[PDB]
PDB file of C-alpha atoms in Angstrom:
ATOM      1  CA  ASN T   1      85.945  26.070 -31.423  1.00  0.00           C
ATOM      2  CA  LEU T   2      84.156  25.031 -27.989  1.00  0.00           C
ATOM      3  CA  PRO T   3      85.339  21.821 -27.375  1.00  0.00           C
ATOM      4  CA  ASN T   4      88.894  22.803 -28.667  1.00  0.00           C
ATOM      5  CA  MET T   5      88.924  25.706 -26.205  1.00  0.00           C
ATOM      6  CA  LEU T   6      88.114  22.954 -22.962  1.00  0.00           C
ATOM      7  CA  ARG T   7      90.377  20.282 -24.412  1.00  0.00           C
ATOM      8  CA  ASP T   8      93.491  21.348 -22.250  1.00  0.00           C
ATOM      9  CA  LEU T   9      91.209  21.753 -19.106  1.00  0.00           C
ATOM     10  CA  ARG T  10      89.777  17.841 -19.756  1.00  0.00           C
ATOM     11  CA  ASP T  11      93.427  16.902 -20.161  1.00  0.00           C
ATOM     12  CA  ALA T  12      94.578  18.215 -17.349  1.00  0.00           C
ATOM     13  CA  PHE T  13      91.455  16.727 -15.375  1.00  0.00           C
ATOM     14  CA  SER T  14      92.363  13.153 -16.511  1.00  0.00           C
ATOM     15  CA  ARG T  15      95.464  13.347 -14.680  1.00  0.00           C
ATOM     16  CA  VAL T  16      93.727  14.925 -11.612  1.00  0.00           C
ATOM     17  CA  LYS T  17      91.085  12.503 -11.440  1.00  0.00           C
ATOM     18  CA  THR T  18      93.259   9.565 -10.766  1.00  0.00           C
ATOM     19  CA  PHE T  19      94.087  10.872  -7.541  1.00  0.00           C
ATOM     20  CA  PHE T  20      90.271  10.875  -6.544  1.00  0.00           C
ATOM     21  CA  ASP T  21      80.113   2.355  -7.961  1.00  0.00           C
ATOM     22  CA  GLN T  22      77.959   4.272  -5.097  1.00  0.00           C
ATOM     23  CA  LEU T  23      78.460   7.909  -5.722  1.00  0.00           C
ATOM     24  CA  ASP T  24      75.795   9.552  -3.823  1.00  0.00           C
ATOM     25  CA  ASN T  25      74.408  12.850  -4.855  1.00  0.00           C
ATOM     26  CA  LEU T  26      75.861  15.385  -6.725  1.00  0.00           C
ATOM     27  CA  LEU T  27      77.857  18.406  -5.022  1.00  0.00           C
ATOM     28  CA  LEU T  28      77.502  20.264  -8.173  1.00  0.00           C
ATOM     29  CA  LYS T  29      73.740  20.042  -8.962  1.00  0.00           C
ATOM     30  CA  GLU T  30      71.819  20.671 -11.752  1.00  0.00           C
ATOM     31  CA  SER T  31      70.397  23.632 -10.216  1.00  0.00           C
ATOM     32  CA  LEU T  32      73.901  25.173 -10.476  1.00  0.00           C
ATOM     33  CA  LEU T  33      73.658  24.468 -14.202  1.00  0.00           C
ATOM     34  CA  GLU T  34      70.351  26.277 -14.261  1.00  0.00           C
ATOM     35  CA  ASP T  35      71.691  29.152 -12.919  1.00  0.00           C
ATOM     36  CA  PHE T  36      74.668  29.112 -15.504  1.00  0.00           C
ATOM     37  CA  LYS T  37      72.014  29.170 -18.191  1.00  0.00           C
ATOM     38  CA  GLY T  38      69.966  32.338 -16.261  1.00  0.00           C
ATOM     39  CA  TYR T  39      70.185  36.090 -16.059  1.00  0.00           C
ATOM     40  CA  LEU T  40      72.872  35.393 -13.097  1.00  0.00           C
ATOM     41  CA  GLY T  41      74.794  32.973 -15.286  1.00  0.00           C
ATOM     42  CA  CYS T  42      77.928  35.096 -15.313  1.00  0.00           C
ATOM     43  CA  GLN T  43      77.807  36.027 -11.601  1.00  0.00           C
ATOM     44  CA  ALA T  44      77.299  32.125 -10.535  1.00  0.00           C
ATOM     45  CA  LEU T  45      80.258  31.115 -13.430  1.00  0.00           C
ATOM     46  CA  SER T  46      82.538  33.836 -11.856  1.00  0.00           C
ATOM     47  CA  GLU T  47      81.979  32.783  -8.448  1.00  0.00           C
ATOM     48  CA  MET T  48      82.050  28.994  -9.108  1.00  0.00           C
ATOM     49  CA  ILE T  49      86.085  29.567 -10.773  1.00  0.00           C
ATOM     50  CA  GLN T  50      86.723  31.889  -8.184  1.00  0.00           C
ATOM     51  CA  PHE T  51      85.396  29.134  -5.603  1.00  0.00           C
ATOM     52  CA  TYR T  52      87.851  26.372  -7.173  1.00  0.00           C
ATOM     53  CA  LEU T  53      91.012  28.526  -7.670  1.00  0.00           C
ATOM     54  CA  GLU T  54      90.961  30.425  -3.803  1.00  0.00           C
ATOM     55  CA  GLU T  55      89.530  27.495  -1.821  1.00  0.00           C
ATOM     56  CA  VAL T  56      88.613  24.092  -3.214  1.00  0.00           C
ATOM     57  CA  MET T  57      92.561  23.390  -5.275  1.00  0.00           C
ATOM     58  CA  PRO T  58      94.496  24.986  -2.385  1.00  0.00           C
ATOM     59  CA  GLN T  59      92.693  22.705   0.265  1.00  0.00           C
ATOM     60  CA  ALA T  60      93.333  19.972  -1.805  1.00  0.00           C
ATOM     61  CA  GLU T  61      96.686  20.250  -2.447  1.00  0.00           C
ATOM     62  CA  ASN T  62      97.149  20.395   1.248  1.00  0.00           C
ATOM     63  CA  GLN T  63      95.090  17.150   2.245  1.00  0.00           C
ATOM     64  CA  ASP T  64      97.537  15.451  -0.500  1.00  0.00           C
ATOM     65  CA  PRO T  65     100.752  16.950  -1.782  1.00  0.00           C
ATOM     66  CA  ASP T  66     101.226  14.203  -4.333  1.00  0.00           C
ATOM     67  CA  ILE T  67      98.676  15.720  -6.355  1.00  0.00           C
ATOM     68  CA  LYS T  68      99.875  19.259  -6.373  1.00  0.00           C
ATOM     69  CA  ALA T  69     101.950  19.611  -9.741  1.00  0.00           C
ATOM     70  CA  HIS T  70      98.263  18.133 -11.620  1.00  0.00           C
ATOM     71  CA  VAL T  71      96.366  20.526  -9.794  1.00  0.00           C
ATOM     72  CA  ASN T  72      98.555  23.507 -10.455  1.00  0.00           C
ATOM     73  CA  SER T  73      98.263  22.593 -13.974  1.00  0.00           C
ATOM     74  CA  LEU T  74      94.348  22.423 -13.892  1.00  0.00           C
ATOM     75  CA  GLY T  75      94.526  25.954 -11.938  1.00  0.00           C
ATOM     76  CA  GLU T  76      96.640  27.419 -14.795  1.00  0.00           C
ATOM     77  CA  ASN T  77      94.378  25.829 -17.758  1.00  0.00           C
ATOM     78  CA  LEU T  78      91.330  27.674 -15.626  1.00  0.00           C
ATOM     79  CA  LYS T  79      92.848  31.021 -15.017  1.00  0.00           C
ATOM     80  CA  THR T  80      93.883  30.636 -18.843  1.00  0.00           C
ATOM     81  CA  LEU T  81      90.283  29.803 -19.905  1.00  0.00           C
ATOM     82  CA  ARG T  82      88.696  32.531 -17.675  1.00  0.00           C
ATOM     83  CA  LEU T  83      91.533  35.090 -19.327  1.00  0.00           C
ATOM     84  CA  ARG T  84      89.897  34.084 -22.501  1.00  0.00           C
ATOM     85  CA  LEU T  85      86.203  34.290 -21.609  1.00  0.00           C
ATOM     86  CA  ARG T  86      86.861  37.877 -19.920  1.00  0.00           C
ATOM     87  CA  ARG T  87      88.900  39.398 -22.732  1.00  0.00           C
ATOM     88  CA  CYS T  88      85.801  38.871 -24.555  1.00  0.00           C
ATOM     89  CA  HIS T  89      83.024  41.384 -22.671  1.00  0.00           C
ATOM     90  CA  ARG T  90      80.907  38.834 -24.584  1.00  0.00           C
ATOM     91  CA  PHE T  91      81.340  35.728 -22.695  1.00  0.00           C
ATOM     92  CA  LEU T  92      82.181  37.245 -19.140  1.00  0.00           C
ATOM     93  CA  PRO T  93      80.754  40.752 -19.104  1.00  0.00           C
ATOM     94  CA  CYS T  94      80.569  40.573 -15.053  1.00  0.00           C
ATOM     95  CA  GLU T  95      84.167  40.558 -14.562  1.00  0.00           C
ATOM     96  CA  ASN T  96      84.680  43.591 -16.718  1.00  0.00           C
ATOM     97  CA  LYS T  97      84.504  47.186 -15.771  1.00  0.00           C
ATOM     98  CA  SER T  98      83.167  50.239 -17.644  1.00  0.00           C
ATOM     99  CA  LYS T  99      85.986  52.639 -19.028  1.00  0.00           C
ATOM    100  CA  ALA T 100      83.623  55.454 -19.095  1.00  0.00           C
ATOM    101  CA  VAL T 101      83.281  55.129 -15.403  1.00  0.00           C
ATOM    102  CA  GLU T 102      86.779  54.745 -14.656  1.00  0.00           C
ATOM    103  CA  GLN T 103      87.155  58.072 -16.981  1.00  0.00           C
ATOM    104  CA  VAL T 104      84.421  59.676 -15.178  1.00  0.00           C
ATOM    105  CA  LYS T 105      86.320  58.835 -11.520  1.00  0.00           C
ATOM    106  CA  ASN T 106      89.344  60.091 -13.183  1.00  0.00           C
ATOM    107  CA  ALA T 107      88.288  63.361 -14.162  1.00  0.00           C
ATOM    108  CA  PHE T 108      86.173  63.678 -11.152  1.00  0.00           C
ATOM    109  CA  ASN T 109      89.209  63.231  -9.076  1.00  0.00           C
ATOM    110  CA  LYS T 110      91.395  65.721 -10.350  1.00  0.00           C
ATOM    111  CA  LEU T 111      89.203  68.358 -10.392  1.00  0.00           C
ATOM    112  CA  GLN T 112      89.018  68.211  -6.611  1.00  0.00           C
ATOM    113  CA  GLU T 113      86.524  70.338  -5.264  1.00  0.00           C
ATOM    114  CA  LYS T 114      85.113  71.671  -8.469  1.00  0.00           C
ATOM    115  CA  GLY T 115      84.337  67.765  -9.095  1.00  0.00           C
ATOM    116  CA  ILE T 116      82.146  67.564  -6.114  1.00  0.00           C
ATOM    117  CA  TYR T 117      80.152  70.545  -7.281  1.00  0.00           C
ATOM    118  CA  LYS T 118      79.830  69.550 -10.963  1.00  0.00           C
ATOM    119  CA  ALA T 119      78.917  65.656  -9.932  1.00  0.00           C
ATOM    120  CA  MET T 120      76.337  66.925  -8.199  1.00  0.00           C
ATOM    121  CA  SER T 121      75.159  69.754 -10.333  1.00  0.00           C
ATOM    122  CA  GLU T 122      74.816  67.047 -13.029  1.00  0.00           C
ATOM    123  CA  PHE T 123      72.662  64.288 -11.157  1.00  0.00           C
ATOM    124  CA  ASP T 124      69.689  65.022 -13.299  1.00  0.00           C
ATOM    125  CA  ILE T 125      71.767  64.332 -16.564  1.00  0.00           C
ATOM    126  CA  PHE T 126      72.553  60.373 -14.560  1.00  0.00           C
ATOM    127  CA  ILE T 127      68.838  60.365 -13.713  1.00  0.00           C
ATOM    128  CA  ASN T 128      68.261  60.690 -17.451  1.00  0.00           C
ATOM    129  CA  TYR T 129      70.933  57.974 -18.234  1.00  0.00           C
ATOM    130  CA  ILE T 130      69.237  55.424 -15.524  1.00  0.00           C
ATOM    131  CA  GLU T 131      65.875  56.153 -17.145  1.00  0.00           C
ATOM    132  CA  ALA T 132      67.611  55.383 -20.558  1.00  0.00           C
ATOM    133  CA  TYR T 133      69.218  52.011 -19.033  1.00  0.00           C
ATOM    134  CA  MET T 134      66.076  50.983 -17.661  1.00  0.00           C
ATOM    135  CA  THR T 135      64.320  51.676 -20.990  1.00  0.00           C
ATOM    136  CA  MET T 136      66.727  49.310 -22.566  1.00  0.00           C
ATOM    137  CA  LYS T 137      66.085  46.734 -20.334  1.00  0.00           C
ATOM    138  CA  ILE T 138      62.302  46.833 -20.681  1.00  0.00           C
ATOM    139  CA  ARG T 139      62.396  46.551 -24.482  1.00  0.00           C
TER     140      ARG T 139
ATOM    141  CA  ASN A   1      55.691  53.206 -14.802  1.00  0.00           C
ATOM    142  CA  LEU A   2      59.351  54.170 -15.384  1.00  0.00           C
ATOM    143  CA  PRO A   3      58.618  58.103 -15.272  1.00  0.00           C
ATOM    144  CA  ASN A   4      56.937  57.400 -12.252  1.00  0.00           C
ATOM    145  CA  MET A   5      59.417  55.242 -10.851  1.00  0.00           C
ATOM    146  CA  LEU A   6      61.877  58.219 -11.100  1.00  0.00           C
ATOM    147  CA  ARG A   7      59.858  61.183  -9.813  1.00  0.00           C
ATOM    148  CA  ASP A   8      60.826  60.994  -6.438  1.00  0.00           C
ATOM    149  CA  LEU A   9      64.460  61.303  -7.194  1.00  0.00           C
ATOM    150  CA  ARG A  10      63.541  63.847  -9.442  1.00  0.00           C
ATOM    151  CA  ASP A  11      61.803  65.747  -6.771  1.00  0.00           C
ATOM    152  CA  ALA A  12      64.728  65.336  -4.543  1.00  0.00           C
ATOM    153  CA  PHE A  13      67.105  66.735  -7.129  1.00  0.00           C
ATOM    154  CA  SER A  14      65.056  69.776  -7.794  1.00  0.00           C
ATOM    155  CA  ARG A  15      65.634  70.882  -4.123  1.00  0.00           C
ATOM    156  CA  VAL A  16      69.179  69.904  -4.377  1.00  0.00           C
ATOM    157  CA  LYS A  17      70.349  71.609  -7.595  1.00  0.00           C
ATOM    158  CA  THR A  18      69.046  75.100  -5.952  1.00  0.00           C
ATOM    159  CA  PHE A  19      72.453  75.074  -4.049  1.00  0.00           C
ATOM    160  CA  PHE A  20      74.240  74.179  -6.904  1.00  0.00           C
ATOM    161  CA  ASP A  21      75.202  80.101 -19.308  1.00  0.00           C
ATOM    162  CA  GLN A  22      78.920  79.163 -19.866  1.00  0.00           C
ATOM    163  CA  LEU A  23      78.659  75.395 -18.786  1.00  0.00           C
ATOM    164  CA  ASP A  24      81.407  73.696 -19.859  1.00  0.00           C
ATOM    165  CA  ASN A  25      81.819  70.068 -20.718  1.00  0.00           C
ATOM    166  CA  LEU A  26      79.973  67.525 -18.968  1.00  0.00           C
ATOM    167  CA  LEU A  27      81.439  65.377 -16.494  1.00  0.00           C
ATOM    168  CA  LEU A  28      78.978  62.582 -17.125  1.00  0.00           C
ATOM    169  CA  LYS A  29      79.557  62.473 -20.867  1.00  0.00           C
ATOM    170  CA  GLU A  30      78.072  60.594 -23.710  1.00  0.00           C
ATOM    171  CA  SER A  31      80.337  57.676 -23.387  1.00  0.00           C
ATOM    172  CA  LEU A  32      78.698  56.817 -19.955  1.00  0.00           C
ATOM    173  CA  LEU A  33      75.486  56.664 -21.536  1.00  0.00           C
ATOM    174  CA  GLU A  34      76.478  54.303 -24.174  1.00  0.00           C
ATOM    175  CA  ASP A  35      78.233  51.839 -21.748  1.00  0.00           C
ATOM    176  CA  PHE A  36      74.938  51.778 -19.871  1.00  0.00           C
ATOM    177  CA  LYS A  37      73.341  50.580 -23.116  1.00  0.00           C
ATOM    178  CA  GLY A  38      76.005  47.952 -23.909  1.00  0.00           C
ATOM    179  CA  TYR A  39      77.124  44.596 -22.332  1.00  0.00           C
ATOM    180  CA  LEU A  40      78.700  46.255 -19.687  1.00  0.00           C
ATOM    181  CA  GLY A  41      75.414  48.408 -18.498  1.00  0.00           C
ATOM    182  CA  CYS A  42      74.896  46.601 -15.366  1.00  0.00           C
ATOM    183  CA  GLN A  43      78.474  46.796 -13.952  1.00  0.00           C
ATOM    184  CA  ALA A  44      78.627  50.505 -15.148  1.00  0.00           C
ATOM    185  CA  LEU A  45      75.242  51.474 -13.546  1.00  0.00           C
ATOM    186  CA  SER A  46      76.129  49.703 -10.386  1.00  0.00           C
ATOM    187  CA  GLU A  47      79.313  51.353  -9.905  1.00  0.00           C
ATOM    188  CA  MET A  48      77.893  54.743 -10.675  1.00  0.00           C
ATOM    189  CA  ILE A  49      75.266  54.483  -8.232  1.00  0.00           C
ATOM    190  CA  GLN A  50      78.161  53.247  -5.719  1.00  0.00           C
ATOM    191  CA  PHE A  51      80.305  56.186  -6.646  1.00  0.00           C
ATOM    192  CA  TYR A  52      77.229  59.043  -6.048  1.00  0.00           C
ATOM    193  CA  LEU A  53      76.474  57.449  -2.765  1.00  0.00           C
ATOM    194  CA  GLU A  54      80.001  56.630  -1.159  1.00  0.00           C
ATOM    195  CA  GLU A  55      81.973  59.408  -2.898  1.00  0.00           C
ATOM    196  CA  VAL A  56      79.981  62.060  -4.102  1.00  0.00           C
ATOM    197  CA  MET A  57      77.015  62.955  -1.840  1.00  0.00           C
ATOM    198  CA  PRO A  58      79.129  62.601   1.646  1.00  0.00           C
ATOM    199  CA  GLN A  59      81.878  64.729   0.283  1.00  0.00           C
ATOM    200  CA  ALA A  60      79.018  67.248  -0.889  1.00  0.00           C
ATOM    201  CA  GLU A  61      77.847  67.295   2.648  1.00  0.00           C
ATOM    202  CA  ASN A  62      81.110  67.908   3.828  1.00  0.00           C
ATOM    203  CA  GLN A  63      81.690  71.200   1.693  1.00  0.00           C
ATOM    204  CA  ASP A  64      78.431  72.556   2.719  1.00  0.00           C
ATOM    205  CA  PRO A  65      76.136  71.187   5.793  1.00  0.00           C
ATOM    206  CA  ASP A  66      73.130  73.472   4.488  1.00  0.00           C
ATOM    207  CA  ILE A  67      72.416  70.669   1.677  1.00  0.00           C
ATOM    208  CA  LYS A  68      72.683  67.817   4.171  1.00  0.00           C
ATOM    209  CA  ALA A  69      68.884  67.424   4.391  1.00  0.00           C
ATOM    210  CA  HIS A  70      68.324  67.318   0.868  1.00  0.00           C
ATOM    211  CA  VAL A  71      71.439  65.280  -0.421  1.00  0.00           C
ATOM    212  CA  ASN A  72      70.348  62.937   2.390  1.00  0.00           C
ATOM    213  CA  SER A  73      67.070  62.760   0.773  1.00  0.00           C
ATOM    214  CA  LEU A  74      68.518  62.378  -2.351  1.00  0.00           C
ATOM    215  CA  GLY A  75      70.865  59.367  -1.515  1.00  0.00           C
ATOM    216  CA  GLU A  76      67.576  57.499   0.254  1.00  0.00           C
ATOM    217  CA  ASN A  77      65.581  57.883  -2.831  1.00  0.00           C
ATOM    218  CA  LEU A  78      68.435  56.612  -5.067  1.00  0.00           C
ATOM    219  CA  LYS A  79      69.475  53.521  -2.591  1.00  0.00           C
ATOM    220  CA  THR A  80      65.428  52.800  -2.737  1.00  0.00           C
ATOM    221  CA  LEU A  81      65.364  52.983  -6.555  1.00  0.00           C
ATOM    222  CA  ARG A  82      68.898  50.643  -6.484  1.00  0.00           C
ATOM    223  CA  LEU A  83      66.886  48.092  -3.897  1.00  0.00           C
ATOM    224  CA  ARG A  84      63.895  47.919  -6.351  1.00  0.00           C
ATOM    225  CA  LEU A  85      66.040  47.350  -9.823  1.00  0.00           C
ATOM    226  CA  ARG A  86      68.048  44.931  -7.820  1.00  0.00           C
ATOM    227  CA  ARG A  87      65.096  42.751  -6.344  1.00  0.00           C
ATOM    228  CA  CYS A  88      64.378  42.254 -10.075  1.00  0.00           C
ATOM    229  CA  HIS A  89      67.174  39.992 -11.334  1.00  0.00           C
ATOM    230  CA  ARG A  90      66.061  41.375 -14.788  1.00  0.00           C
ATOM    231  CA  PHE A  91      67.204  45.152 -14.185  1.00  0.00           C
ATOM    232  CA  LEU A  92      70.255  44.658 -12.088  1.00  0.00           C
ATOM    233  CA  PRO A  93      71.430  40.944 -12.338  1.00  0.00           C
ATOM    234  CA  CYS A  94      75.223  42.111 -11.628  1.00  0.00           C
ATOM    235  CA  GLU A  95      74.073  42.816  -7.619  1.00  0.00           C
ATOM    236  CA  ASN A  96      72.795  39.784  -7.167  1.00  0.00           C
ATOM    237  CA  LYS A  97      74.222  36.661  -6.559  1.00  0.00           C
ATOM    238  CA  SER A  98      73.434  32.578  -7.490  1.00  0.00           C
ATOM    239  CA  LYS A  99      71.411  30.910  -5.049  1.00  0.00           C
ATOM    240  CA  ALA A 100      72.768  27.647  -6.454  1.00  0.00           C
ATOM    241  CA  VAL A 101      76.201  28.882  -5.564  1.00  0.00           C
ATOM    242  CA  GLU A 102      75.597  29.708  -2.193  1.00  0.00           C
ATOM    243  CA  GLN A 103      73.975  26.330  -1.559  1.00  0.00           C
ATOM    244  CA  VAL A 104      77.143  24.430  -3.412  1.00  0.00           C
ATOM    245  CA  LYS A 105      79.431  26.304  -1.181  1.00  0.00           C
ATOM    246  CA  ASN A 106      77.272  25.711   2.023  1.00  0.00           C
ATOM    247  CA  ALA A 107      77.269  21.800   1.486  1.00  0.00           C
ATOM    248  CA  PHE A 108      81.060  21.956   0.652  1.00  0.00           C
ATOM    249  CA  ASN A 109      81.949  23.923   3.909  1.00  0.00           C
ATOM    250  CA  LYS A 110      79.750  21.513   6.130  1.00  0.00           C
ATOM    251  CA  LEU A 111      81.275  18.196   4.570  1.00  0.00           C
ATOM    252  CA  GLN A 112      84.503  19.027   5.725  1.00  0.00           C
ATOM    253  CA  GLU A 113      87.173  17.033   4.047  1.00  0.00           C
ATOM    254  CA  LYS A 114      85.008  15.214   2.161  1.00  0.00           C
ATOM    255  CA  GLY A 115      84.020  18.204   0.480  1.00  0.00           C
ATOM    256  CA  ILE A 116      87.023  18.883  -0.893  1.00  0.00           C
ATOM    257  CA  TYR A 117      87.278  15.026  -2.536  1.00  0.00           C
ATOM    258  CA  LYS A 118      84.200  15.431  -3.761  1.00  0.00           C
ATOM    259  CA  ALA A 119      84.340  18.843  -5.402  1.00  0.00           C
ATOM    260  CA  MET A 120      87.667  17.737  -7.123  1.00  0.00           C
ATOM    261  CA  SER A 121      85.957  14.381  -8.261  1.00  0.00           C
ATOM    262  CA  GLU A 122      83.480  16.261  -9.892  1.00  0.00           C
ATOM    263  CA  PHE A 123      85.593  18.916 -11.887  1.00  0.00           C
ATOM    264  CA  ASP A 124      84.669  17.419 -15.207  1.00  0.00           C
ATOM    265  CA  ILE A 125      80.643  17.889 -14.097  1.00  0.00           C
ATOM    266  CA  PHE A 126      82.252  21.707 -13.796  1.00  0.00           C
ATOM    267  CA  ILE A 127      83.526  21.543 -17.155  1.00  0.00           C
ATOM    268  CA  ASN A 128      80.345  20.429 -18.836  1.00  0.00           C
ATOM    269  CA  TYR A 129      78.777  23.107 -16.988  1.00  0.00           C
ATOM    270  CA  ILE A 130      80.933  25.525 -18.079  1.00  0.00           C
ATOM    271  CA  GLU A 131      80.906  24.430 -21.604  1.00  0.00           C
ATOM    272  CA  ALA A 132      77.035  24.737 -21.459  1.00  0.00           C
ATOM    273  CA  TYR A 133      77.276  28.071 -20.365  1.00  0.00           C
ATOM    274  CA  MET A 134      79.490  29.006 -23.275  1.00  0.00           C
ATOM    275  CA  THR A 135      77.167  27.262 -25.804  1.00  0.00           C
ATOM    276  CA  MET A 136      74.470  29.699 -24.103  1.00  0.00           C
ATOM    277  CA  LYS A 137      75.955  32.796 -25.156  1.00  0.00           C
ATOM    278  CA  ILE A 138      77.257  31.719 -28.686  1.00  0.00           C
ATOM    279  CA  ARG A 139      73.732  31.175 -29.052  1.00  0.00           C
TER     280      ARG A 139
END
C-alpha cells in the first residue's frame, strides 16, 4: 500500500536528484516532521505540498531549463498524490470543504432578504451546534 | 466550563432575537451538525463562523440599523470565542499554521538561490516525511 503509493514520486525524484560529503544542516528539519505528526499535521503537509508546487519547482525550472522535463513529472506525481489523499477526507481533511455548509450558503443566497432574517433568527441553533462540536473535542 | 464559555454569546443573542408558530424548515439543518461532528468538523465550523461575521451580520445591520448595537456585540462575542478556541490548537487546528513550515519558508527565502538547490535536493526527505504522516493516519 503506502510504499507502493509513493513509488512513482520516488522514481521521478531519482532522475531529478542527478541534477543536484559535507552536507550542512537540513533545510527540512526534524521539527517539520514533528508538526506533520501533530494536530497541525494536515495544515503543515498541505502548506508544504503547495510550497513545492508553486514556489520551489517553478524557481528550480527557471534556474536550469535542463531539469524541466523531470521537475514537471515530479510535480505531476505530487499533484496526483495530493488528489488521492484529498479524495479521502481521512488523509487530507483540511483540503476538503463541508457539503452541508455549501448547501446552507446556497439556500441562504437564494432566499435573498429572507435568508438574512432566517440565519439571524437561528443563531441560537448555531450556538447549540458549536456547543456540540466543543463537547465532541473535549471527549 | 463549556456552558460558561458560551454564556456571553447567548446573552447577546437574547437581545438580538427580539428584533427577529409556523416556523418552516431550519436553514441550519441537522446535516450541518453532523459535519461539525465529523472529520470536516473544524473546516465546517470555521467556515460558518466566517459566514456569520462577513456575510450575515453586516447584511442584517444594513437591513435594519436599529439592531446594530446588538449585532455588533454578538459579533464581538463570536470573534472572542473564535480567538479562544483558536489559541488552543486542540479546538480549532484548521485556523492554525505550522511554525515549522514558517521557519522552513523563512530560511528558504533568505538563502536566495541556494534555497532552491537545497529544497530540491532534499525532496526525498520530504517524501519520507509524507510517508510518516500517512503511516500516522493509517494507525
